Automatic annotation (TrEMBL), chain A:
<dbReference type="GO" id="GO:1990904">
    <property type="term" value="C:ribonucleoprotein complex"/>
</dbReference>
<dbReference type="GO" id="GO:0006412">
    <property type="term" value="P:translation"/>
</dbReference>
<dbReference type="InterPro" id="IPR021138">
    <property type="entry name" value="Ribosomal_eL20_eukaryotes"/>
</dbReference>
<dbReference type="GO" id="GO:0003735">
    <property type="term" value="F:structural constituent of ribosome"/>
</dbReference>
<keyword id="KW-0689">Ribosomal protein</keyword>
UniProtKB/TrEMBL annotation, chain B:
<protein>
    <submittedName>
        <fullName>60S ribosomal protein L12-A</fullName>
    </submittedName>
</protein>
<comment type="similarity">
    <text>Belongs to the universal ribosomal protein uL11 family.</text>
</comment>
<comment type="function">
    <text>Component of the ribosome, a large ribonucleoprotein complex responsible for the synthesis of proteins in the cell. The small ribosomal subunit (SSU) binds messenger RNAs (mRNAs) and translates the encoded message by selecting cognate aminoacyl-transfer RNA (tRNA) molecules. The large subunit (LSU) contains the ribosomal catalytic site termed the peptidyl transferase center (PTC), which catalyzes the formation of peptide bonds, thereby polymerizing the amino acids delivered by tRNAs into a polypeptide chain.</text>
</comment>
From TrEMBL, chain C:
<comment type="similarity">
    <text>Belongs to the universal ribosomal protein uL10 family.</text>
</comment>
<feature type="binding site">
    <location>
        <position position="41"/>
    </location>
    <ligand>
        <name>Mg(2+)</name>
    </ligand>
</feature>
<protein>
    <recommendedName>
        <fullName>60S acidic ribosomal protein P0</fullName>
    </recommendedName>
</protein>
<comment type="function">
    <text>Component of the ribosome, a large ribonucleoprotein complex responsible for the synthesis of proteins in the cell. The small ribosomal subunit (SSU) binds messenger RNAs (mRNAs) and translates the encoded message by selecting cognate aminoacyl-transfer RNA (tRNA) molecules. The large subunit (LSU) contains the ribosomal catalytic site termed the peptidyl transferase center (PTC), which catalyzes the formation of peptide bonds, thereby polymerizing the amino acids delivered by tRNAs into a polypeptide chain.</text>
</comment>
TrEMBL record, chain D:
<dbReference type="InterPro" id="IPR000702">
    <property type="entry name" value="Ribosomal_uL6-like"/>
</dbReference>
<feature type="domain" description="Large ribosomal subunit protein uL6 alpha-beta">
    <location>
        <begin position="97"/>
        <end position="178"/>
    </location>
</feature>
<dbReference type="GO" id="GO:0003735">
    <property type="term" value="F:structural constituent of ribosome"/>
</dbReference>
<protein>
    <submittedName>
        <fullName>60S ribosomal protein L9-B</fullName>
    </submittedName>
</protein>
<feature type="domain" description="Large ribosomal subunit protein uL6 alpha-beta">
    <location>
        <begin position="12"/>
        <end position="85"/>
    </location>
</feature>
RNA sequence: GGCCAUGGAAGUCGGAAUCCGCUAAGGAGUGUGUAACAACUCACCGGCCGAAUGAACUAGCCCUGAAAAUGGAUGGCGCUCA
């Protein structure tokens, strides 16, 4: 269960450099302790800065703009497998940016055995145009007048024994 | 080594062969087929001296 | 890249022969050999040019270019199936004497 | 990928009345009725009209989608079996030993009796499936005509006859003897 | 002796085949993989050899 | 029926070659067939339908790779949208 955070940090000011540049990252983390931890993890992949020589300036939750609008998200990924490092791009249907990332973490765990530690989120983009959708497993839900049944419904029973024959209509 | 100015004669004695464009295409048919032998065709092998006038070397627009 | 160049040469020579001569009628064949076609153009050295190719290319490559040579337009719905072209200009009788000449049949 | 929905359209000719109830297809045509149970597949049926039927798979994976056009083809084969019939022609192929084939009836059952195959003293008997008609062609020498409404039974009887005539302990590239299916068509040309 | 028309009919079922190189399977000539599980559906195939 | 080999080899036994001409189409030929041709089949181009298609690679689970001796061990039962 994740949240999207805006984390802003900078190098500690010096008499040489008293206003270092402020860098922001959007972090998908379960809580604010991991959000500031993940921030320093990525700054040390790019900038000559450390947690000992730096400073966290702001941590803020980024809420969904239209949390009850159904969207299609494209997520660009860079994950590590048992053998190498790979770039990937996948698409998810959800109403929040965070909920697509939660589906993403479940999805790469299941099909590629990629743990949380092995995944970098390069970019999450809401696809405005139906022509922006490249993947067929989410494009099939953008067809006009979409209808489908749910055959073979299995009902969960509170009791061990039922006195009537089971059914699966729905 | 031939032509011996008679490679057109070989084309105009074999006048009934290549159903080409304008007579000179008949000469190229003997040019192509005689390359499969390999002799003193102007010093080397054909598919070369052929390809000179094929693009346009000296002058054989014989009527 | 070669095909688009050979396509360009095909439309180049398609319009080169269109203005040089004029007027053409129905010209369809079937079960016609390669040596069968060589016979017609053997006697038709210069009085006619056996323009050849296919269908789908010819229709659109001219239909889109109905600006420099419009006139045709509604003429395109005529091009169905195995149809060649014999680019020439003589008379309704003077061409069928030299073209219809060779016939190969079968039971 | 779990395709949301996949469809196929059956086409019912004018004189044919398909009839489907609980995945039990009963196809009726001028030539008769054929029935087939499909309870081993998860498909649903919709009658578009009297001449067309939609066959649908909902939320099916690759193999479960693959099982849809085969349902279509089986019902289409049923339709053409009750509107055109099926006919397999077999030619008798032998280099030296003529194959003596008779249509015998023993114990109230029809059998195809192959004798002298590759000179063997053994008599081969193939049971003729119900609904399958055998005939020795008069217009052709060494030809057997297997006909019937059901394509599956006709082709399987033909295969039985072909399989009982397999060559053992020889170079089968050289010893090409046997009974082979030469033509697979319909009763109505 | 078999007439050439009948010898082509026979050769379909006896000769026109491909063979798996690891487990010796009679495969269709156009087959790209062996249908047997024991060899792992290998693509290492070769045509059935002919009399000569 | 290209040259040379060859009893013969004409595309389809074998060697230098791998060209040309017409073509939108065609290889001095991908096969079956001949003592040899012929024959048909393909290479490529046509007509037809009409919206997708082919190739290489990466890594998840599964399978092949995977052979030992008393009967037997994910602890056992058993489990397959587990
Ligand atoms: Mg750097
Ligand atoms: Mg999910
Ligand atoms: Mg998933
Ligand atoms: Mg998914
Ligand atoms: Mg990492
Ligand atoms: Mg209950
Ligand atoms: Mg033996
Ligand atoms: Mg396997
Ligand atoms: Mg294993
Ligand atoms: Mg559970
Ligand atoms: Zn195998």
């Amino acid at each position: 269960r994740l949240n999207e955070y805006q984390v802003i940090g900078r190098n500690l000011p010096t008499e040489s450099v008293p206003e270092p540049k402020l860098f922001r990252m959007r972090i998908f983390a379960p809580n604010t302790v991991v959000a500031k931890s993940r921030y320093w993890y990525f700054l040390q992949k790019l900038h000559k800065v450390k947690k000992a020589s730096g400073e966290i300036v702001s941590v803020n939750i980024i809420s969904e703009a239209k949390p009850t609008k159904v969207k299609t998200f494209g997520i660009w990924l860079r994950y590590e497998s048992r053998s190498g490092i790979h770039n990937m791009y996948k698409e998810y249907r959800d109403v929040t940016r965070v909920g697509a990332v939660e589906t993403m973490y479940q999805d790469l765990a299941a099909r590629h055995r990629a743990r949380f530690r092995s995944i970098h989120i390069l970019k999450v983009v809401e696809l405005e145009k139906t022509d922006d959708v490249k993947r067929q497993y989410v494009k099939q839900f953008l067809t006009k007048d979409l209808k489908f049944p749910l055959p073979h419904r299995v009902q969960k029973s509170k009791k061990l024994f039922q006195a009537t024959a089971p059914t699966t209509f729905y | 080594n031939i032509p011996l100015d008679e490679i057109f004669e070989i084309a105009r004695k074999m006048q009934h062969k290549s159903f080409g464009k304008n007579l000179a295409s008949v000469s190229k048919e003997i040019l192509g087929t005689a390359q499969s032998v390999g002799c003193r065709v102007d010093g080397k092998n054909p598919h070369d001296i052929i390809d000179a006038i094929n693009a346009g070397e000296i002058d054989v627009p014989e009527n | 890249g070669g095909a688009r160049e050979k396509k360009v040469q095909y439309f180049s020579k398609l319009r080169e022969l269109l203005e040089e001569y004029k007027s053409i009628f129905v010209v369809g064949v079937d079960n016609v050999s390669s040596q069968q076609m060589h016979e017609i153009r053997k006697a038709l050295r210069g009085d006619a040019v056996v323009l050849m190719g296919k269908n789908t290319m010819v229709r659109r490559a001219i239909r889109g270019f109905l600006s420099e040579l419009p006139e045709f337009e509604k003429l395109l719905p005529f091009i169905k199936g195995n149809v060649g072209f014999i680019f020439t200009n003589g008379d309704l009788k003077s061409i069928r004497d030299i073209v219809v000449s060779n016939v190969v049949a079968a039971p | 990928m779990k395709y949301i929905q996949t469809d196929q359209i059956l086409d019912i000719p004018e004189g044919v009345t398909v009839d489907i109830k609980a995945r039990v297809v009963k196809v009726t045509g001028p030539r008769g009725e054929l029935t087939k149970d499909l309870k081993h597949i998860d498909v649903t049926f919709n009658k578009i009209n009297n001449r067309a039927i939609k066959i649908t798979v909902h939320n099916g994976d690759r193999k479960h989608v693959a099982a849809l056009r085969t349902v279509k083809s089986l019902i289409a084969n049923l339709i053409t079996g009750v509107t055109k019939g099926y006919k397999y022609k077999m030619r008798f192929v032998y280099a030296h030993f003529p194959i003596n084939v008779n249509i015998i009836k023993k114990d109230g059952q029809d059998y195809v009796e192959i004798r002298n195959f590759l000179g063997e003293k053994r008599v081969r008997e193939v049971k003729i499936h119900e609904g399958v008609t055998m005939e020795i062609s008069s217009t052709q020498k060494d030809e057997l005509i297997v006909s019937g409404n059901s394509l599956e039974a006709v082709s399987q009887n033909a295969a039985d006859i072909q399989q009982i005539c397999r060559v053992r302990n020889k170079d089968i590239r050289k010893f090409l003897d046997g009974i082979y299916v030469s033509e697979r068509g319909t009763i109505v040309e | 002796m078999i007439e050439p028309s009948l010898k082509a009919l026979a050769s379909k079922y006896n000769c026109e085949k491909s063979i798996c190189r690891k487990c010796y399977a009679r495969l269709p000539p156009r087959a790209t993989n062996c249908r047997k599980r024991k060899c792992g559906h290998t693509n290492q195939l070769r045509p059935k050899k002919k009399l000569k």
